[PDB]
């Protein structure tokens, strides 16, 4: 079956060049077109252009125009992106697609076979872990209280409720950017109003790149 | 440069239902050169029809497409569960290809209006200098809702984001986060500061509020 595997995620700096891979395996490569593709958070897919490694006949989106290099070695069956100039609005999952081959092999132009993505975050952020803060419950049936995750970098975070023994109505929200550059995110929890007296509630947050683990007691706020 | 529009934005059907999504190309789309592709979150895109019509091996019979010229249609003619997911259309006739803005394919289930949750900002982040105050919609169908912010009867703009859970695995509805970010001085010059919410569920605005301070 035909695979395309691509290279590892990265961030980078505004002003630097990023290259990613994809290797494919298992199907025709040199006589049909590997394009890129980026689909920015939030937003949908967009073409970047494509090449045709046989003789390395290149098809560059007009706004990728002086930025953009594919290319591709017939040898090791890889196809390159060289992207330069990078801005925060390079920020996006980058997807290597190979055309279909349709009628005993005809291009199909379409799309067929994808790689994995490659997530490429810009940004001048250096990496930190979050401050974690209650929600507390309010005073004034069914109670909501949570954890406030704030001014980490880069993503993820993972939210646990206590160690994982409570799951049900947890709801762990995408975190957002801020315009700090850093992002933050929310974990609520709805519980029955009888147990705030009795139940410990506990956030166990975990930031990797940070190496970063928070727990934070989540109760009625006093008074 | 080929302009390609989808309709609707959002389709809400019922599991088991025949569904039928609508593209529009602002040319005619040269040699029926359309595809349709389904995303699921976090995967990449799977190709479902090529050349208008056509299935790529894999892709089950119950999708089909349709169209020539400006109008194409993407047809499922009974919706499994694995198929609510956001479907783009994709000319490729010209040298520049590009696809439509997506219609989310989600689940049609009875309205149900969000339970309303504010919480103050924490003593310790005061300390930070940054009040977050935030606003929880839980467990809400349909996914439109409207989160406004007052803070001494003044709406706020600018100073707030929101995300929004994926349709729920269980119950098949959504939750909603919104963050009013203010400086430390700032959020200590006032007093009230209310999340007022509309929802298709709600027979009139639900406003839930705190007095800094008590």
């Known amino acids: 079956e035909v695979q395309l595997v691509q290279s590892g995620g990265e961030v980078k700096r505004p002003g630097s060049s990023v290259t990613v891979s994809c290797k494919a395996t298992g199907g025709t490569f040199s006589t049909l077109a590997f394009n890129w593709v980026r689909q920015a958070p939030g937003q949908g897919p967009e073409w970047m252009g494509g090449?045709?490694?046989?003789?390395?006949?290149?098809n560059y989106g007009q706004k990728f125009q002086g930025r953009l290099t594919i290319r591709a070695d017939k040898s090791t069956t890889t196809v390159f992106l060289d992207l330069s100039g990078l801005t925060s609005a390079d920020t996006a999952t980058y997807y290597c697609a190979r055309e279909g081959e349709g009628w005993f092999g005809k291009p199909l132009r379409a799309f067929e076979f994808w790689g994995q993505g490659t997530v490429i975050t810009v940004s001048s952020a250096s990496t930190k872990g979050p401050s974690v803060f209650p929600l507390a419950p309010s005073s004034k049936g069914t109670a909501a209280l949570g954890c406030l995750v704030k001014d980490y970098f880069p993503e993820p975070v993972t939210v646990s409720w206590n160690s994982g023994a409570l799951t049900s109505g947890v709801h762990t929200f995408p975190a957002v950017l801020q315009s700090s550059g850093l992002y933050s995110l929310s974990s609520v929890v709805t519980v029955p109003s009888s147990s705030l007296g009795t139940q410990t509630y506990i956030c166990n947050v975990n930031h990797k790149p940070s190496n970063t683990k928070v727990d934070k007691k989540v109760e009625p706020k006093s008074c | 440069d080929v302009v390609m529009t989808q309709s609707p934005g959002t389709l809400s059907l019922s599991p088991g239902e025949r569904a039928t999504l609508s593209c529009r190309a602002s040319q005619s789309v040269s040699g029926g050169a359309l595809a349709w592709y389904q995303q699921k979150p976090g995967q990449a895109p799977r190709l479902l029809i090529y050349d208008t019509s056509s299935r790529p091996t894999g892709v089950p019979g119950r999708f089909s497409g349709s169209g020539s010229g400006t109008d194409f249609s993407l047809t499922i003619s009974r919706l499994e569960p694995e198929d609510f997911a956001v479907y783009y259309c994709?000319?490729?006739?010209?040298?520049?290809?590009?696809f439509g803005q997506g219609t989310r394919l989600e689940i049609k289930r009875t309205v149900a209006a969000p339970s309303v949750f504010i919480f103050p900002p924490s003593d310790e982040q005061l300390k930070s200098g940054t009040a977050s105050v935030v606003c929880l919609l839980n467990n809400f169908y349909p996914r439109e809702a409207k989160v406004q912010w007052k803070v001494d009867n003044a709406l706020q703009s600018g100073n707030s984001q929101e995300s929004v859970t994926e349709q729920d695995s269980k119950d098949s509805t959504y939750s909603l986060s919104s963050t009013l970010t203010l400086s430390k001085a700032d959020y200590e010059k006032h007093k009230v500061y209310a999340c007022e919410v509309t929802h298709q569920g709600l027979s009139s605005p639900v406003t839930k509020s705190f007095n800094r301070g008590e």
């Open positions: 994709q000319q490729y006739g010209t040298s520049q290809s590009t």
């Open positions: 090449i045709v490694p046989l003789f390395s006949i290149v």
